[PDB]
């Protein structure tokens, strides 16, 4: 009967909640009182990339931290040169309803996707001298929300039908599919060791997945609304989330609970993006109020403001060596700060 | 400098091509085709001549139309409806064979923050079977509040008034029309509505608004 299974599930939930509450002896807020603050931080825009003309949606840095990539509703996928503002490629897309971008770690490929339910992979090192479509990965039902390269042969995708998949670019077939979510997955982030990843959905829950076996190991349920952004801590043991509740939270993998909340009374707009710095001391969040905020990871206090855009800050990223931060927006301009 | 002059030349050529494409791509007019299931969304585009989005196009009197049907995929509408702002108008259509879900959808669309100043064209479809049903069955089974006679004209007027009563912002306008499977008339209605809208936009852009 359903009653016995419901009672068993309730007992299991109560047991795990009791264990989680028992595992918490103190809080990090009362441990961090012995370290000094970072002071006031004021960055200035050193570059401005003005080639697009409609609502940049995604961007991604290269491994060498000099090249970029950007997608817009204009239907163009363009890769930039950050140091000299030069344009080195401009790929014309088949459909203009795109929402994702990805740069291969080896620098040979670029991926894209959107409302057409298909992930397209492009080859940048052809002998003929032009970029051409390599594969068209089909099989998902809902729209694509995120994509990430593991190597030059396998990719992971998150869609709007509550499932994630692991593909094989060599043959175009889905090796493994990850199910267990209720709403639709919005974001995705890969571990530095490339052995595990996490995802956040619209049912206010983020969970940890293993790429080898399609099992779900843990579930985090501390938020109040849909999760919009996900990123790993540089160490590989923690991660932070952003939601339409206008708050951010920091979670721990080996303690399986929440550590900090990054919120203030004056901010009532949802988060669109999140990222860490190189050493993990600072946390950058792109807000809906036309500006970005810099917050201490260990004290939950604001350290600076990166205003200077005229519309939503849709995307945000930090280079590998950590010498710059790029900020896309709906005004069709990319800013490089330092 | 060094041979980076060729790189600068390549960048300039890319920029010129981008500007030309952007200039050439702005002459078209975009329209969003929303409605309930089995309402006749396919019929209007078939007369005017699949998993994700489908985009048909046609030209009529030196003007190019591009119609988008984004109702084929089932997901959270709050996560992809903000992509279709800055569209010229909505082409919401309703069938008279039912039904309150259509009223709910109209109420949701007409008051969205992204679509606060977008004109809406309303089509009332399949009037003949509506007349047959009203001759066979009363309208009170669908609208208990209705008190008028069971004839065609007042019933259609009552349905149109009920649909139009959901508008709250007075800035926008709703163009009602009962096509009843009329040939080559819906295109003319859309053309006149588009002409009015573009004239208003041109007048507002100069500062006379």
């Amino acid at each position, epitope marked *: 009967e359903l009653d016995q299974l419901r009672q068993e599930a309730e007992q299991l939930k109560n047991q795990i909640r009791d264990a989680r509450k028992a595992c918490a002896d103190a809080t990090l807020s009362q441990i961090t009182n012995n370290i000094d603050p970072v002071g006031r931080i004021q960055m200035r825009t050193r570059r401005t990339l003005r080639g697009h003309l409609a609502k940049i949606y995604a961007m991604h840095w290269g491994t060498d931290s000099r090249l970029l990539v950007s997608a817009s509703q204009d239907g163009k996928l363009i890769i930039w040169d950050s140091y000299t503002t030069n344009k080195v490629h401009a790929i014309p897309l088949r459909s203009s309803w795109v929402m994702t971008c990805a740069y291969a770690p080896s620098g040979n490929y670029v991926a894209c996707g959107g409302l057409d339910n298909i992930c397209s992979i492009y080859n940048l090192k052809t002998r*003929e001298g032009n970029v051409r479509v390599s594969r068209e990965l089909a099989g998902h039902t809902g729209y694509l929300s995120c994509c990430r390269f593991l190597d030059d042969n396998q990719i992971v995708t998150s869609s709007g039908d509550t499932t994630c998949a692991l593909w094989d670019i060599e043959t175009g077939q889905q090796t493994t599919t990850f199910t267990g979510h209720t709403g639709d997955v919005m974001s995705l982030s890969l571990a530095p060791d490339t052995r595990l990843f996490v995802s956040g959905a619209c049912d206010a829950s983020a969970k940890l997945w293993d790429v080898r076996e399609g099992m779900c190991r843990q579930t985090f349920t501390g938020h109040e609304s849909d999760i919009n952004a996900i990123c790993f801590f540089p160490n590989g043991n923690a991660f932070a989330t952003g939601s339409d509740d206008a708050t951010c939270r920091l979670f721990d993998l080996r303690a399986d609970q929440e550590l900090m909340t990054y919120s203030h009374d004056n901010i009532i707009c949802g988060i669109t993006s999140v990222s860490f710095s190189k050493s993990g001391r600072l946390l950058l969040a792109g807000y809906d109020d036309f500006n970005c905020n810099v917050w201490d990871a260990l004290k939950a206090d604001r350290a600076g403001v990166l205003a200077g855009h005229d519309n939503r800050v849709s995307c945000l990223g930090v280079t590998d060596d950590g010498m710059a931060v790029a900020t896309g927006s709906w005004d069709s301009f990319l800013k490089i700060w330092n | 400098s060094a041979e980076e002059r060729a790189a600068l030349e390549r960048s300039k050529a890319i920029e010129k091509n981008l500007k030309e494409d952007g200039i050439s791509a702005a002459k078209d007019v975009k329209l969003l085709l929303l409605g309930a299931d089995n309402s006749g969304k396919s019929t209007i585009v078939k007369q005017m001549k699949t998993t994700g989005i489908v985009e048909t196009h046609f030209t009529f009197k030196n003007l190019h139309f591009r119609l988008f049907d984004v109702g084929g995929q089932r997901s959270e509408r709050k996560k992809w409806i903000h992509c279709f702002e800055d569209v010229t108008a909505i082409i919401f259509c309703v069938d008279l064979s039912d039904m309150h879900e259509s009223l709910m959808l109209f109420d949701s669309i007409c008051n969205n923050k992204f679509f606060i100043d977008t004109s809406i064209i309303l089509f009332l479809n399949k009037k003949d079977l509506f007349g047959e049903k009203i001759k066979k069955s009363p309208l009170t089974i669908c609208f208990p509040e209705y008190t008028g006679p069971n004839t065609y004209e007042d019933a259609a007027a009552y349905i149109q008034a009920q649909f139009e009563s959901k508008n709250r912002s007075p800035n926008k306008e709703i163009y009602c029309h009962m096509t009843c499977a009329t040939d080559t008339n819906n295109a003319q209605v859309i053309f006149d509505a588009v002409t009015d809208i573009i004239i208003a936009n041109n007048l507002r852009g100069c500062g006379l608004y």
Partner: single-chain antibody
Amino acid sequence: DVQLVESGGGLVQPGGSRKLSCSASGFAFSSFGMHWVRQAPEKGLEWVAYISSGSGTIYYADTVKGRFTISRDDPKNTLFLQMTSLRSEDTAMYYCVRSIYYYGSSPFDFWGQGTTLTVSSGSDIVMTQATSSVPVTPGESVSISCRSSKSLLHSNGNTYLYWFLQRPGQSPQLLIYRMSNLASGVPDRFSGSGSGTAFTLTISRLEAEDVGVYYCMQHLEYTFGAGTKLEL
């Protein structure tokens, strides 16, 4: 299958004119540069002309300025060369070359076949190669070196030196660009290094297919070296 086919050779009396054409297929011709390197019958290589992409920048050699001109036709995928007032020093073989310039590109990657033009009887950077012939045996390792008059290092950090290999009865090939980067196809047995104005090339585990003449070229501003030959 990238193809560069040339035609227009023959015998021309002194003082006349003759046109040569390059017909290309298999790649996007409109996105590439074009050069016209030529080789004397029993000497090294020499640079002649250059036509950009979009036909917006043309350079000519000092000894052939005014007498010759270059043009391209993107629709038909062809490149021309019009030469007037031929002298006795204009007899050589002419090569059609390919090049693309952006961040990370490798110019001078594909070379043509060649046309023979014979005529009847009637301030600069100098690069020198200290050796002209080096004895070698299979399984051994050798070292090539050439020096320049001035430093090839720019303020941006890139040094512009190129290495080429020509075999018996064959068109030359690209091995190293910018003194450190290996071409797409060359085996790992070849590696190059150098600093300032002294440049070296080393090859390990020599086979029977490595025999030929090696040229070193600079690309800092708008020449080839004399070239050394390995002997079996």
